[PDB]
Design a protein around this ligand. Sequence first.
Ligand SMILES: Nc1nc2c(ncn2[C@@H]2O[C@H](COP(=O)(O)OP(=O)(O)O)[C@@H](O)[C@H]2O)c(=O)[nH]1
Ligand SMILES: [Mg+2]
Lengths: 427, 67
Amino acid sequence: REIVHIQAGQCGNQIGAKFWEVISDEHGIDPTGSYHGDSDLQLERINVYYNEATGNKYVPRAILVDLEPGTMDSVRSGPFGQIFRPDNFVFGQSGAGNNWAKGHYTEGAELVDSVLDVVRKESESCDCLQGFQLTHSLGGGTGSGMGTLLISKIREEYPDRIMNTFSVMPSPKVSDTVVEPYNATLSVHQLVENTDETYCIDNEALYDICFRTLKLTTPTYGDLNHLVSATMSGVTTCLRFPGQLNADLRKLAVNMVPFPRLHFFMPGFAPLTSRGSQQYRALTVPELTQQMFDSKNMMAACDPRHGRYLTVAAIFRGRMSMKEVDEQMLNVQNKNSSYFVEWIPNNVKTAVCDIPPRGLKMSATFIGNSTAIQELFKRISEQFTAMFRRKAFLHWYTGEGMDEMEFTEAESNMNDLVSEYQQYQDA
Amino acid sequence: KREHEREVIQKAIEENNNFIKMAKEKLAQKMESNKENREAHLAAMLERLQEKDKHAEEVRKNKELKE
Ligand SMILES: Nc1nc2c(ncn2[C@@H]2O[C@H](COP(=O)(O)OP(=O)(O)O)[C@@H](O)[C@H]2O)c(=O)[nH]1
Ligand SMILES: [Mg+2]
C-alpha cells in the first residue's frame, strides 16, 4: 500500500524535508539512499513511503512543489537534499506573494499540470496506491492556494483514493502577512470538502509550547519545525511499521471520522523537547499518558476540556509494559469519561511500536478528533471578519479575478463547520 | 469548479486588458484635446497680430489719401 507524498510552498517544503530527514533515520536510510540499519522491522513496510532503486537504493515517493525556486534550492542543498528524485522537483519562477488567488487561479493554474504529470508517473509504479499526503501552510499563497488546487485535481483523477494533509494554521504570534486569515479561510473551505484526514498544526500552539514550556525566549521556524517533525513521525508510525491498528490511511479514516466533514484532528506529543537539549530521564508510562493528553502538549491551540473527544488514536513508542499502557489508557477514559462522547463506544484506540524515535527511549503521539477544534476555526473566522467587514486588503484578490462573493461563501462554510462541531458537543 | 476556475482567470485577463485599453484611449484623447487647444491659442494670437498689419496698411493708406 504505497503513499504518494507532496509538499507545497515554503512551509510545506521546509517541514516536508524535515519529515523525510527524520523518518529516513528511523528506517536506516542515509542521504545517499542506502540502508544501514540493524533491525528488519525498519524495512518491512518501507515500501509505503520509499521506492526501491538500483543497487538496493531507496528513494522517497515525494513530489516537491513551489511557485518560486528559493526554498526548494535550499532543500536540494540541505542534509538529505540528494535523496529526492530530481525529476520530482516541479517549480515556477513567479511566486505567489502570499496570495491564495495567485496559487489557486492564475500563477498556480499555469504550473499544476506539470505537477500532476509527476503524481501520475509515481502512481503507476505503485502496486496498490492507498492515497496521498500533502504538507503545506494555509496562510501563504502556494501551499494554501495551489495546494488546494492540487487536492481538487487529484481527487478528480483519483476519486477512490484517500487524501491526507498536514496543514499548518496561521497565527498572529507567528505571522508573515495580514492576509493569512483570508488565505486560511479560503483553504479550509477546500479542505472540508476534498480531504479525508487533516492534521491541524497550529503555529499558535507551536509558538506557545516553545515559549511557555520549552522556555525558548524567541523561537524560530526551525524550532517550530522540531515539534512538527516529531509529530509527523509519530502520526505515521502505524503506517511505516508493522501493526494491526490504523495500518493504512483508509482504516485510520474509518476509525477517526464519524462524519465526513468532521475530519480535522488535534495532534499531541510527549515528552515535549527542544532542539539539542538532551533528555536523560525516561518518562514513566503514567507520565507519557498524562502529558500526551494535556493541552500544553496539543499541537492545536484548543482547550480539549472545552469540547468532547469523538475519536482518539494513541501510539506509544519504545520498550515498555504494554499492560501498563492499557491500564493507563483505560484510567484516563475512566477518570475523565465526560470528555469522551458516550454514543461512540470504545472510541479510544491504542497502538504500540518497539522502535522509539531518535534521542528518546520512549514517546507517545496523540491524535484526537475533538469538537474543541472549533476554537481554531472560530479564531480564524474572527480575524477574517475584522478585515472583511471593511473589505480590507481585498484588492490583492480581486486583481486576480476573484469576486467578493467567494469570500462570503468561504466564511459561511467555515462557520457551518463550527456549528456542526458544536452540535455534537451537546449531544 | 473547473469551469469556475476558467472564468476567474478570464476575468483577470479581461479587466487587465480593459485597464490597458482605457488608459491608452484616455491618453490619446488628452493629447489630441491639448493639441487642438494649444494650436487654437497660437492661431488666435497670430490673427490678432495679422490685423495689426492690416491696420498699419490702413494707416499708411490714410496718409497717402492725406495729400
Ligand atoms: N511551521 C512553519 N510555518 C511556516 C514556515 N514558513 C512559513 N510558515 C507559515 O506559513 C504561512 C506563510 O506561508 P508560506 O509557506 O511562506 O507561503 P507559500 O510559500 O506561498 O506557500 C505563515 O502563516 C507562516 O507562519 C515554516 O518553515 N514552518
Ligand atoms: Mg513565506
